[PDB]
Write a protein that binds this ligand. Structure first.
Ligand SMILES: *[B-](O)(O)CNC(=O)c1c(OC)cccc1OC
Ligand SMILES: *[B-](O)(O)CNC(=O)c1c(OC)cccc1OC
Ligand SMILES: [Cl-]
Ligand SMILES: [Cl-]
Ligand SMILES: [Cl-]
Ligand SMILES: [Cl-]
Ligand SMILES: [Cl-]
Ligand SMILES: [Cl-]
Ligand SMILES: [Cl-]
Ligand SMILES: [Cl-]
Ligand SMILES: [Cl-]
Ligand SMILES: [Cl-]
Ligand SMILES: [Cl-]
Ligand SMILES: [Cl-]
Ligand SMILES: [Cl-]
Ligand SMILES: [Cl-]
Ligand SMILES: [Cl-]
Ligand SMILES: [Cl-]
Ligand SMILES: [Cl-]
Ligand SMILES: [Cl-]
Ligand SMILES: [Cl-]
Ligand SMILES: [Cl-]
Ligand SMILES: [Cl-]
Ligand SMILES: [Cl-]
Ligand SMILES: [Cl-]
Ligand SMILES: [Cl-]
Ligand SMILES: [Cl-]
Ligand SMILES: [Cl-]
Ligand SMILES: [Cl-]
Ligand SMILES: [Cl-]
Ligand SMILES: [Cl-]
Ligand SMILES: [Cl-]
Ligand code: NA
Ligand code: NA
Lengths: 466, 466
């Protein structure tokens, strides 16, 4: 039979059933092929695969295996009741809205609970484990800003260009209906989720030959082509909620990745271990980088620019809203998919909404609807398991380097030549957090990530006038 | 004894007790003085006033009077439970935060319920009816924008200057730490609650000789000096919550004022009517103006720039959050007082928070704390009386005039004299709602409310940009 993590039987041999059943069958496939001495060469034959897949299914059926899952029964039940009771809050006037959520332990990668969809009876597609969609702007902290910080190419108060710029094909890089503004901090870039700063960040990574793919593959992401301008905005990427939750698990867990899983162990009746989850922790980002990103992602939620989440949760459960929440939102180019990823030090909860056929949601479906739904979901989870989110706080690792930098440039105050006239770059300052050894460079002319000659003249006009 | 609106006995002869008792005594005082044929001259004498004041008190105490209040018992009790249960949500790290609320019937001026403070036992000060504080930016819809619209000087998409400008004394007009930006619609001015636009608006009213005082006095505001630069920002105004609620009642009720009251009737034991509230409706703003303002204040709340209220309420009670809420926040110069005024077509709920000794609150006390508290208050009210808020919608009155104007100038497209070459003014347009006969004028060089020559060249720089 299939059990929760506490031995309680889920079933003998709905989303839960079919999902845990499917994972187990995959594990039984590997075991059975190995048992029967099937080489990888013969395992490539498609008729052989169908046989061993059918075999794996019957072994579970007419066999006496104990399948131990990571599922927390109380927490998963409560998530089902939340989507039953509160699912309808997602419906935004563009048809029935589908949903997928995964709740993951940050220290193990274990999946404690999930939401497969609005209602298994009406639609069986598994939106937590099977559906794959662009993660949109939630790509940014992982693939762009996170890597640039880790490479010591950027710190927390570094300045980026959000000046209008075009893709290679002459099209304006857009952010809803805006073609861009001017220079801005990483903080503002993340809080608003502007697109141009992420484009430049990724361009810079390519220019420095960074092994971006090495980072992503260490987190289990399969991206077929890295040579894409809109990659950091989610272009050319498609992920399940379970896999993408694993990325945010990595950032939340001070940069150490643990592979997601639902099955922890399968035993024969007599105790033989057919399968057991083996942990393989990987330091994907430096502790400095991850803890710096946590600080930035904390302000993403607290600024409330792209999500009402903290307001929604404050009202439902103000004590829970005082835990140390960080998170990032995502919106695809036509409002086809909305993401909201949330973490406390203990747990990450991933969330996607969208339509199965990929037509648009409303403009506010992620900002308001999904944020409100996920507040209910977070509150249901806590009510069922009152300690599970924890009261720990995210905190800068000691290894973090702090520089005093000029707010205007994001770099150390000093002299720079602005068209002939060697100039004293003065003015008010902030602490910038870096994940290298030396911190922030002295100010340069091209002080920002990205920007055209025209842009930099314009910016320096402003700066120079004070 | 004193009774609820339905005749149920409140008490025989704690905020509720002393409030209804004190109002009843003022009424008995008037009645007794006239009964005894005391002259207006004689009633100026201080010893005579005191005797009649004492007389009015004992008359109630000993007599067999029946005082009929407007108070709704279920609603008032539920408001007290909310402040008892949820008042702590106001505490923001600047010490114990005090509070006053008044719930008013928009069609009658009757007060259904109120919150005098956090806890009468601990602090007897009545923050609904007694204490007077600057209403800050909740002054703007009433005294500046409202009047300019009624006077046919402004419409809903009219443009205003938020360019830096100084008071007469040379100090910058501030908005938090901003000295201003550029031109902006009335909508954006209202959603953000910028200060400079209101300054210019009131200046314009002065220049036009508008009887501003006549309006405010018809709503029962007592402002001793109108010649004040910061009046439209709440400088030189101090008001009770009950009185200010009456101002928002006026806007909500399509421009028609009804005097606030808690006492509807006082009867001698034998049936003689000692006092009876007499309704005297007044059309303060035209129906056009008021319904245009309603539309603007709907977006103040829905934009969520200065209050999280709509998010807070959506999570508590999504069906109530779909009623037609409009409102305005306010914040005094040093964060000493926060206001949030809310209306549906049926009710108006005013709220203030602050400290008895007038020291600062936190930056977010109004934006988040008071908004969350008031969402709980509003929800408590609805639970106690499920239909009281109504599902009616605010709607433009038919007498409203609609003009197509340039998004850029807020005036009708046309040729203009731009410091040299006559220019054909083109570009995207919108509907602008006016309360006059002829709607928006054709574009003129000085198209916005306020702005220096310097400002106007700069603006026309961009507009002439296309
Ligand atoms: B990211 O997915 O948050 C970038 N977001 C957007 O580009 C975006 C959008 O694109 C069509 C539409 C509305 C809001 C957006 O981001 C706030
Ligand atoms: B009005 O009271 O809304 C004008 N508001 C402000 O000036 C204000 C402020 O001044 C101390 C500080 C923070 C936020 C404000 O309003 C948005
Ligand atoms: Cl399920
Ligand atoms: Cl499934
Ligand atoms: Cl369990
Ligand atoms: Cl997609
Ligand atoms: Cl394109
Ligand atoms: Cl790569
Ligand atoms: Cl993937
Ligand atoms: Cl590549
Ligand atoms: Cl698994
Ligand atoms: Cl490290
Ligand atoms: Cl917060
Ligand atoms: Cl919000
Ligand atoms: Cl669909
Ligand atoms: Cl330094
Ligand atoms: Cl270094
Ligand atoms: Cl350079
Ligand atoms: Cl760069
Ligand atoms: Cl009371
Ligand atoms: Cl009653
Ligand atoms: Cl006047
Ligand atoms: Cl007054
Ligand atoms: Cl005057
Ligand atoms: Cl009264
Ligand atoms: Cl009598
Ligand atoms: Cl009228
Ligand atoms: Cl809304
Ligand atoms: Cl005090
Ligand atoms: Cl017109
Ligand atoms: Cl007219
Ligand atoms: Cl000038
Ligand atoms: Na987003
Ligand atoms: Na305000």
């Amino acid at each position: 039979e299939i059990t929760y993590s506490d031995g309680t039987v889920i079933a003998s041999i709905d989303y839960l059933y079919f999902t845990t059943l499917a994972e187990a069958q995959e594990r039984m496939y590997d075991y059975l092929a190995q048992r029967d001495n099937v080489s990888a060469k013969e395992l490539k034959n498609e008729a052989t695969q169908k046989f061993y897949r059918d075999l794996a299914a019957k072994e579970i059926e007419n066999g006496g295996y104990k399948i131990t899952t990571t599922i927390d029964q109380k927490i998963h039940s409560a998530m089902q009741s939340a989507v039953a009771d509160y699912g309808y809050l997602l419906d935004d006037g563009t048809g029935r809205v589908e949903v997928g959520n995964v709740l993951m332990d940050n220290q193990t990668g274990a999946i404690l609970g999930f939401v497969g969809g609005r209602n298994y009876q009406e639609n069986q597609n598994n939106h937590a484990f099977d559906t794959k969609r662009s993660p949109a702007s939630t790509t940014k902290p992982l693939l762009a800003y996170g890597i640039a910080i880790d490479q010591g190419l950027m710190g927390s108060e570094t300045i980026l260009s959000n000046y209008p710029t075009n893709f290679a094909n002459g099209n304006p890089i857009m952010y809803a209906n805006s073609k861009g503004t001017g220079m801005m901090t990483l903080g503002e870039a993340l809080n608003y989720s502007w697109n141009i700063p992420a484009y430049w960040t990724y361009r810079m990574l390519r220019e420095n030959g960074v092994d971006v793919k090495g980072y992503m593959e260490k987190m289990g992401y399969e991206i077929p082509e890295y040579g894409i301008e809109s990659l950091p905005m989610g272009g050319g990427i498609e992920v399940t909620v379970a896999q993408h939750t694993n990325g945010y698990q990595t950032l939340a867990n001070n940069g150490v990745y643990h592979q997601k899983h639902v099955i922890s162990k399968i035993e024969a009746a007599d105790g033989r271990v057919v399968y057991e989850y083996q942990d393989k922790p990987v330091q994907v980002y430096s502790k400095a980088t991850a803890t710096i990103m946590q600080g930035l992602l904390r302000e993403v939620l607290s600024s409330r620019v792209t999500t009402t989440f903290k307001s929604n949760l404050t009202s439902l459960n103000p004590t829970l809203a005082n835990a140390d929440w960080i998170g990032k939102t995502g919106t695809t180019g036509q409002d086809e998919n909305m993401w909201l990823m949330l973490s406390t030090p203990r747990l990450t909860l991933g969330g996607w909404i969208g339509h199965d056929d990929n037509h648009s949601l409303s403009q506010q479906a992620g900002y308001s609807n999904n944020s409100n739904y996920m507040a209910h979901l977070v509150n249901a989870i806590q009510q069922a398991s009152p300690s599970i989110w924890g009261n720990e706080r995210f905190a800068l690792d000691p290894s973090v380097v702090k520089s005093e930098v000029l707010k205007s440039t994001g770099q150390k105050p000093g002299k720079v030549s602005v068209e002939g006239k060697e100039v004293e770059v003065t003015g008010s300052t902030v602490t910038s957090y870096w994940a290298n050894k030396s911190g922030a460079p002295a100010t340069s002319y091209r002080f920002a990530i990205g920007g055209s000659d025209a842009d930099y003249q314009n910016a320096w006009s402003s700066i120079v006038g004070s």
